[PDB]
Structure 1
């Protein structure tokens, strides 16, 4: 009874990172993993892999955080501080290749599905294609 499994996933990651879990399980899908194939390959995480709960395929996602800290509040910095879904089931948000954005001035990344597959901002420039802007991460 999830309206948007994707924005759920991201939200599931986001809730975890904020207490810093080892991994987390999201229900598995071909398009989900295909997206994770980007977070991890761009280093927001360690990565993922196909696990099992009661016969139900999930994806365990191991989370890259960062160094400890002196002073009050030793809590590490996230590698993912900011992730939020852009094109929602409520509003489907599409760009062409010229309308493509740049997250945090080249610092962050925009994940987007296109007909050349799930790529990034840079990659859509490199490939010269647009698609549905799925989310933005930093």
Structure 2
């Protein structure tokens, strides 16, 4: 079965970007859409949009890359150099507002899920709350 929907999505994204896909579909879920909202706002993805594949709901994720490069291998630098799942089924990970990590010395983010909604580490710290540590992106 599909054991971890959230992890499935981060991977679909990690996988598509590595081959430079423009778009990329992932089965829609309220929660997954909540995450994508941050991904866009934090500028990691051009954005995303609801779509119907074979009749079922999906979320097109519009990938973003750096510009073309010089020398051999003109492949663009990724905008999403990283993106790793943390809390996972059978090893849930929650943090207090004092334990919210500082990803990549601030240049990267961390998406938490708080009783105040899905926020980034900075947002969470502001609202002074903690919660399940969904993932880490940079």
Structure 1 segments, 4+ long, off by >2 Å, are none
Structure 2: runs of 5 or more not aligned: none
Distance 2:108 2:128 in 1: 19
Q: Give the secondary structure class of the aligned counterpart of 1:9.
A: helix
Structure 1: runs of 5 or more not aligned: none
Paired residue total: 138
Report the TM-score, using the length of structure 1 for normalisation. 0.99
CA RMSD after TM alignment: 0.5
Q: Shift in Å at residue 20 of structure 1?
A: 0.4
Q: Give the secondary structure class of the aligned counterpart of 1:97.
A: coil
Tell me the alpha carbon deviations over residues 70-113 of structure 1, each in whole angstroms, 9 at most, x when there is no partner.
10110000000100000011200000100111100000000010
Distance 1:5 1:99 in 2: 25
Report the TM-score, using the length of structure 2 for normalisation. 0.99
User: Larger strand proportion, structure 1 or 2?
Assistant: 2
Matches within 5 A, 1:34-73: 34-73=34-73
